[PDB]
Design an enzyme around this catalytic site. Structure first.
Site, PDB file in Angstrom:
ATOM      1  CE  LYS A 185     -17.378  30.989 -37.972  1.00 20.32           C
ATOM      2  NZ  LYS A 185     -16.328  30.069 -38.553  1.00 20.32           N
TER       3      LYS A 185
HETATM    4  C1  PDG Z   1     -13.934  33.335 -33.146  1.00 25.22           C
HETATM    5  C2  PDG Z   1     -14.329  33.991 -34.420  1.00 25.22           C
HETATM    6  N1  PDG Z   1     -14.444  35.316 -34.532  1.00 25.22           N
HETATM    7  C3  PDG Z   1     -14.798  35.954 -35.641  1.00 25.22           C
HETATM    8  C4  PDG Z   1     -15.109  35.315 -36.817  1.00 25.22           C
HETATM    9  C5  PDG Z   1     -15.496  36.079 -38.077  1.00 25.22           C
HETATM   10  O1  PDG Z   1     -16.757  35.647 -38.640  1.00 25.22           O
HETATM   11  P1  PDG Z   1     -17.306  36.201 -40.021  1.00 25.22           P
HETATM   12  O2  PDG Z   1     -16.702  35.301 -41.047  1.00 25.22           O
HETATM   13  O3  PDG Z   1     -18.841  36.073 -39.867  1.00 25.22           O
HETATM   14  O4  PDG Z   1     -16.741  37.619 -40.087  1.00 25.22           O
HETATM   15  C6  PDG Z   1     -15.008  33.841 -36.837  1.00 25.22           C
HETATM   16  C7  PDG Z   1     -15.296  33.155 -38.135  1.00 25.22           C
HETATM   17  N2  PDG Z   1     -14.613  31.921 -38.177  1.00 25.22           N
HETATM   18  C8  PDG Z   1     -13.819  31.397 -39.266  1.00 25.22           C
HETATM   19  C9  PDG Z   1     -14.400  31.360 -40.671  1.00 25.22           C
HETATM   20  C10 PDG Z   1     -13.204  31.870 -41.468  1.00 25.22           C
HETATM   21  C11 PDG Z   1     -13.470  32.024 -42.922  1.00 25.22           C
HETATM   22  O5  PDG Z   1     -13.279  31.029 -43.641  1.00 25.22           O
HETATM   23  O6  PDG Z   1     -13.897  33.140 -43.266  1.00 25.22           O
HETATM   24  C12 PDG Z   1     -13.187  30.078 -38.858  1.00 25.22           C
HETATM   25  O7  PDG Z   1     -12.799  30.071 -37.685  1.00 25.22           O
HETATM   26  O8  PDG Z   1     -12.946  29.055 -39.533  1.00 25.22           O
HETATM   27  C13 PDG Z   1     -14.610  33.175 -35.604  1.00 25.22           C
HETATM   28  O9  PDG Z   1     -14.519  31.838 -35.532  1.00 25.22           O
END
Ligand code: PDG
Ligand code: PDG
Ligand code: CL
Ligand code: CL
Ligand code: CL
Lengths: 394, 394
Positions: A185
């Site tokens: 992120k």
């Molecule tokens: C809109 C949205 N919601 C929820 C999440 C979940 O985040 P976490 O990984 O902290 O649970 C992401 C993570 N975005 C992903 C990363 C995916 C990966 O490679 O794990 C992305 O959109 O590429 C996101 O873009």
């Protein structure tokens, strides 16, 4: 992404947990030497984003699960969600025992007001709004829909921290919002997430629910009460520490994304075929991605192939890719898992093999999103711009 | 607990991540300089515990969630659970939409074979066996119940890592086992846990489910498949680096626990009124606690007070406390939460205000356990012994 600015600040902040601090985010006053990294991250969030409350926890996904529970969104509730988002959006709804209801995106790449209007039923409890690719939806109209129908507005800001809509940070506008600090992120904890809100009852539910219902009152962990059940989404102090160092750099990071996106968008605007994503508040764009459209689907396919061939990495044709668009989620469509999911216990619910999102298809079939990186020099931007122009050349 | 031995190895392991590694447990080959802390702790768990597979993730609670899903335990399934355990045990079941079914403990302070047998129905999928306070159940008879009834045997070793039964590491005897590496456990990641198993199908499901169904095949993360839906329980490389350093100390921790346990117990055995917890495999005891019983509840109450008054700290009268015994879990009994939990979609749920575990009450109302610390000097032990002696003096 934030990892590109890894320097001494991050190393130092984490080493401080190890040298003087403790690994657990609560208690241990005596021996943590006033090092409360998790606590400090949450306060810095509240102050930078101008929100009353912030609760840091294990991931963005855990954020969504926690925000939903904290907001009264539970088993059996209908939750409107878009078909262009990361899979976690839909997984968290299902794991909650809730029922995802797909609504159409518009040219903002986020839920459309009218799209939402069209699938509101009486079972509808919430809108799960995603600020995709670093920009935002038509928020005043969506707020008004939620107020008129009495719906909770949840903002998934996991891909758009530092963005805003009319002087309000994204994630602060609805009832509850979520951030991610996963390793790719804008700002990272390695892994982590946050729930944010101005609603204290939501905040209380959030901190309790993500720690087994622990009230977090007093100085004896063992003596605390548990007015509710919960789960464990606690974040470590090392993860928090890294997040603390990175959040201190958020303004520099947003400025670099904005500068880099501008330069590239400006030069692309002289290629006549290129249309750009709609941005309701251009000043509030976090600028994590440059999202553009071609006139036809075939032409989109061809440009996608030629961007790659000409060295323009970090381009995402979401329509054909596996992690961001409903069409290629057969797993979700057919409820695939090695054990029965709670959603299976609900009779009256969508057949997930049969969702049609025509207006999202119309947009997404012609949409390519380019990641805006922080490391790019002006020379590298110039070269990327030349490679883009060659990719469009005919 | 492992926190008592924090020294240069834990600092060094985590600083190695921050100085030469990366934060994310997968991919980033080109820039992590071959630092795979999560990978290494998994391998080391496989070696130490003679298990085929280990999966590291965000907590012990997430381990329980992930193990259930991975073993086929899901919505509608009955899961037999003790009334003496951490809350997380029952929380994880409810959240899967599975139905916790309470069975009686015996004087091992773990599920009784005959308690388990009395509450099997055709809906039972699994026995959720907890190795409470560092020691074990009658594992040969339990395993036999699970074979005869075609039930999954899940082992919660979250408080008993390093323990064994007849040469088999606790957590490896059933179909799937669970560890915790939270900040107060034997071995810590700050926050962390793991799913261990000899069944490859279970392992594959665990690593996929805890990462949104990612298959983890190949070098390109975005190109990976998702055979199933999932969640996020990924562990940061910093948490893993700490657990790695801790896990190398496990043998020493356990030696120090047994030696210290034996001193206090030897000494308490000379108090005629004391009876001890039953230990099915004495040399497999991890020794995290000395647990003892008094003849009556009144006398237990009295001894609890007198122990604390004489400076015998670290004494837990679970029966009367909030986090480890069903009787003080009104929140669970009445299913209290801010949104409806998945268990609420199962319309012939047991009534959890009416659970009768009389044999468990009769043991637990008279049980007290004393946490064996690692920091204790020969003289602190001698003083402790003499202090226990004063408290029993009547
Ligand atoms: C809109 C949205 N919601 C929820 C999440 C979940 O985040 P976490 O990984 O902290 O649970 C992401 C993570 N975005 C992903 C990363 C995916 C990966 O490679 O794990 C992305 O959109 O590429 C996101 O873009
Ligand atoms: C049997 C058992 N299962 C699950 C867990 C949960 O693990 P994790 O904390 O990683 O999610 C514990 C935690 N041990 C608790 C510590 C609880 C606390 O303070 O948070 C205990 O029994 O005291 C446990 O002992
Ligand atoms: Cl854009
Ligand atoms: Cl994708
Ligand atoms: Cl004992």
């Amino acid at each position: 992404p934030g990892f590109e600015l890894f320097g001494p600040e991050e190393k130092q902040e984490v080493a401080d947990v190890m040298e003087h601090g403790f690994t657990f985010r609560y208690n241990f006053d005596h021996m943590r030497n006033d090092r409360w990294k998790t606590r400090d991250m949450e306060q810095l969030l509240c102050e930078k984003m101008n929100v009353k409350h912030a609760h840091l926890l294990s991931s963005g996904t855990a954020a969504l699960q926690t925000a939903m529970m904290a907001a009264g969104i539970g088993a059996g509730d209908e939750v409107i969600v878009p078909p262009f988002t990361f899979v976690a959006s839909v997984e968290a709804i299902f794991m909650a025992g809730a029922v995802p209801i797909f609504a159409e995106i518009d040219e903002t790449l986020c839920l459309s007001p009218e799209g939402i209007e069209a699938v509101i039923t009486p079972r509808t409890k919430a809108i799960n709004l995603v600020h995709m690719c670093g920009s935002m939806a038509k928020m005043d109209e969506i707020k008004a829909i939620c107020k008129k129908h009495n719906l909770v507005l949840l903002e998934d800001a996991c891909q758009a921290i530092g963005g805003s809509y009319k002087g309000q940070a994204l994630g602060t506008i609805g009832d509850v919002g979520c951030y991610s600090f996963d390793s790719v992120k804008t700002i990272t904890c390695g892994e982590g997430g946050a729930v944010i809100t101005n609603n204290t009852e939501i905040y209380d539910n959030a901190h309790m629910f993500s720690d087994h219902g622990h009230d977090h009152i007093g100085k004896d962990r063992g003596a605390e009460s548990h007015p509710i059940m919960g789960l464990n989404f606690r974040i470590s102090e090392m993860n928090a520490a890294l997040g603390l160092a990175q959040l201190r750099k958020l303004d520099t990071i947003i400025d670099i994304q904005r500068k880099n996106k501008k330069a590239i968008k400006d030069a692309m605007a002289s290629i006549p075929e290129v249309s750009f994503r709609e941005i309701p508040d251009p000043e509030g764009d976090s600028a994590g991605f440059l999202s553009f459209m071609l006139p036809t689907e075939a032409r989109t396919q061809e440009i996608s192939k030629k961007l790659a061939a000409n060295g323009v990495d970090g381009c995402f044709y979401w329509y054909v890719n596996n992690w961001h668009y409903l069409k290629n989620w057969k797993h979700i469509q057919e409820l695939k898992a090695p054990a029965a999911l709670p959603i299976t216990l609900i009779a009256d619910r969508p057949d997930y093999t049969q969702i049609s999102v025509p207006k999202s298809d119309a947009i997404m079939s012609r949409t390519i999103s380019m990641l805006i990186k922080l490391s790019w020099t002006d020379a590298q931007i110039a070269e990327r711009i030349e490679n883009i122009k060659k990719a469009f050349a005919q």
